[PDB]
Design a protein around this ligand. Structure first.
Ligand SMILES: O=S(=O)(Oc1cccc(F)c1)[C@@H]1C[C@@H]2O[C@H]1C(c1ccc(OCCN3CCCCC3)cc1)=C2c1ccc(O)cc1
Ligand SMILES: Cn1c(N)nc2cc(-c3ccccc3)cnc21
Lengths: 7, 207, 234, 10
């Protein structure tokens, strides 16, 4: 997910 | 494990330093939802970087970090909105240039009920004279609690934040009974913040 | 103001004495989605009547207006059913004790669409109470806090409810100290117990969504009382 | 009125 990429 | 070894005052300054900025909005049922959506999206980017600076968060696996932010993101946006709306009775300060009242929450169906709950939370914080040092503790509790070896470490950090809240109240001169009562009052508001997020997530699902 | 003049030991005794009984379901000895939801809604309906009697025995609840009493129960009724279910399921790992003759595991929760998600959250809360070794005196304090707190933010009368809530806070700390917990352990455990109430609110709201979908799909006939309690959240 | 209203009075 994008949340995964931002982390 | 430099999260359990922090002092109470170090916990406060670390959380205060990690505070995200106050963003501006790019300002019908579609126009207002567009501004709130655009605002929340930009806030989320800062929230993810703020979460990485909450002591004990980076010690978790990336999977647990994702799960905590997935569960808590709307609660964290809401307690942020409620906090900066404290000095604006009857108004919600989504942004310095976007100060909305209760009636402007009727443009979107079902929005006014949640507007009322957010305003009631702001009035509650105002009546308690919630301090900024307490606010950042509560927001870190929401992050770590709303999705909770690995589970024990999360509860260890949560106990440290509890110690920090009690430390702030003892520093303010509250008696032992007043510290426990105020601690309970603050944490029970998180139940209402959870309720508002549940409701808001239901309506945001309706897209 | 006679609730505010209760000692901590008198608060506990009054709450323990007000406890409702454990009811039975009318189990059928095959499970369909409809037959299981019928057992649970029938049980929840009969428990609601006893909950109303219990609420009137919570110190301070009598003092509120009839309109304020309705609002608090309308807000918290499912949280109250759930914390009671989680409490009596503590000694049954991996199982939920809806009734002494209705003890189900998560694979039986799969009988109803969307039920197993709530089932897993209730089981998780039960094991959390078990790891904390939650005491009956602490349970009845927490259940009364739900009653008075859940609807207090969506209302002078507010001040009275918060004074009673503070008294239950005093009572919880008193129980933890009498149990030998250190002063630091007292506020740590108080926080742990109160943060669970946010999970219980979460489960109640997901459960209200599920009950609303069961009604809107004609799975089971809800009682008029249950229909009114559900309508208050819609 | 309401059933809850009635039950609380009874
Ligand atoms: O949801 S509500 O409580 O309000 C209502 C009520 C009824 C109907 C509604 F539609 C909204 C909620 C409270 C307040 O008003 C709504 C809202 C919001 C939040 C996120 C949104 O979009 C996220 C989408 N993203 C894109 C994808 C990535 C994830 C994020 C859109 C709106 C609010 C909000 C926004 C920013 C804040 O600092 C604080 C609060
Ligand atoms: C609609 N619904 C769902 N989905 N789970 C429930 C669970 C109960 C319950 C019954 C007895 C004791 C505790 C909870 C009642 N209703 C429920």
């Amino acid at each position: 997910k994008i949340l995964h990429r931002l982390l | 494990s430099l999260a359990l070894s922090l002092t109470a005052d170090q916990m406060v300054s670390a959380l205060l330093d990690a505070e995200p900025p106050i963003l501006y909005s790019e300002y019908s049922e579609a126009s207002m939802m567009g501004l709130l959506t655009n605002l929340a999206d930009r806030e989320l980017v800062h929230m993810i970087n703020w979460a990485k600076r909450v002591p004990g968060f980076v010690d978790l696996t990336l999977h647990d970090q994702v799960h905590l932010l997935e569960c808590a993101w709307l609660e964290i946006l809401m307690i942020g909105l409620v906090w900066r709306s404290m000095e604006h009775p009857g108004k919600l300060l989504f942004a310095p240039n976007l100060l909305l009242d209760r009636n402007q929450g009727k443009c979107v169906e079902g929005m006014v009920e949640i507007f009322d709950m957010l305003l009631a939370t702001s009035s509650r914080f105002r009546m308690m004279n919630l301090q900024g040092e307490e606010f950042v503790c509560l927001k870190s509790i929401i992050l770590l609690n709303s999705g909770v070896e690995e589970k024990d470490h999360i509860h260890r950090v949560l106990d440290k934040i509890t110690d920090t809240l009690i430390h702030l109240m003892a520093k303010a001169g509250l008696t032992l009974q007043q510290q426990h009562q105020r601690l309970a009052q603050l944490l029970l508001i998180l139940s209402h913040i959870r309720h508002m997020s549940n409701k808001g997530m239901e309506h945001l699902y309706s897209m």
